[PDB]
Design a protein around this ligand. Sequence first.
Ligand SMILES: Nc1nc2c(ncn2[C@H]2C[C@H](O)[C@@H](COP(=O)(O)NP(=O)(O)OP(=O)(O)O)O2)c(=O)[nH]1
Ligand SMILES: [Mg+2]
Ligand SMILES: [Mg+2]
Length: 341
Amino acid sequence: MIVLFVDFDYFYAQVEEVLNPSLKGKPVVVCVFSGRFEDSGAVATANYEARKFGVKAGIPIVEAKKILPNAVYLPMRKEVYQQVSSRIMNLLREYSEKIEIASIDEAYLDISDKVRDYREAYNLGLEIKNKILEKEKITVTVGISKNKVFAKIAADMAKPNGIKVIDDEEVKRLIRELDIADVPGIGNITAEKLKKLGINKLVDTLSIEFDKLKGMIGEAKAKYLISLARDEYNEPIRTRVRKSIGRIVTMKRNSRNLEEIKPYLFRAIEESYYKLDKRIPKAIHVVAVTEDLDIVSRGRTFPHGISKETAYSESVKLLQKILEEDERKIRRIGVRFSKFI
DNA sequence: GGGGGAAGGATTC
DNA sequence: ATAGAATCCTTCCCCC
Ligand SMILES: Nc1nc2c(ncn2[C@H]2C[C@H](O)[C@@H](COP(=O)(O)NP(=O)(O)OP(=O)(O)O)O2)c(=O)[nH]1
Ligand SMILES: [Mg+2]
Ligand SMILES: [Mg+2]
């Protein structure tokens, strides 16, 4: 099997430059203004010119300005970045019927019925990397290996504007030399938990016995890293059906008074039902972030569809149930819809 | 013993 | 100081 991976380079900032080529070369940093005061929020992404001085996703907009107070700070236009992303995807379907859209800047191509050697897979790559540059003027980074994981890891080192093939005996090489936090699916919570058991590379998952591994990171994670250690990561490319749609907004004031959170909640449903459009959910969840950044939610499943009048009605009792069972101020309110028809 | 949901956790975008 | 969005997974609990 041969898997082809596509990670658009700093996709949000790149699109802003395609629409305003003057920015090309300057530190661009796209922001998520929360609104509670001036320059409150997070950085969604920053182009590599701004990445150098440590302007990355996650750090608040304040810190991103003590570092580069003269960079170009633009508000995120996710609706514009989506329209550009779909046009790029609709050019990738021209290379395989079996394609998986992972995220907005990510896609796997199963091209085993279109090539059969990493050399022709490599030669397919640039004809991707340039058809995209030909029609949408965006650079991408492609990775190719024997499964969806190492194709991911390939692009993880090749980016930006990169191309990389990880052959089946570098796969053997990596299992023994790859820091395991750099395995896709292992964030900081579980990376630390692995060091605590002396697991630095993927091979150490077989030297240790199983239930020591399961009880700390979980059964699916354990059976996941275990299958990659023995070079037995199956896993194909299948169309991803969007199973959830929602929106969650941040209040200008921390509060728990219900008639203060009703406006933000009702505005979260108006946008969510627009994002739905012809999709009827059977379940609504009321997500809420606390004043201490914790995450609590209450939901319900209906045997039928939910019309905006029924979502307006349900979301207030789920909201009541939250405040019923916790004493903390609410910082972010939202809603989320699943179980579509 | 195990199927099958509704609420916190963790990854990544 | 600490966005938004969505996926999968674990854990507790009702049910054969
Ligand atoms: N709202 C929001 N959006 C984010 C966040 N993180 C990423 N995104 C959105 C905006 C990101 O541009 C888009 C893709 O994210 P990546 O693949 O993780 N990084 P990119 O491809 O951008 O650059 P490079 O690969 O060179 O780091 O996901 C975030 O924390 N918040
Ligand atoms: Mg990318
Ligand atoms: Mg990505």
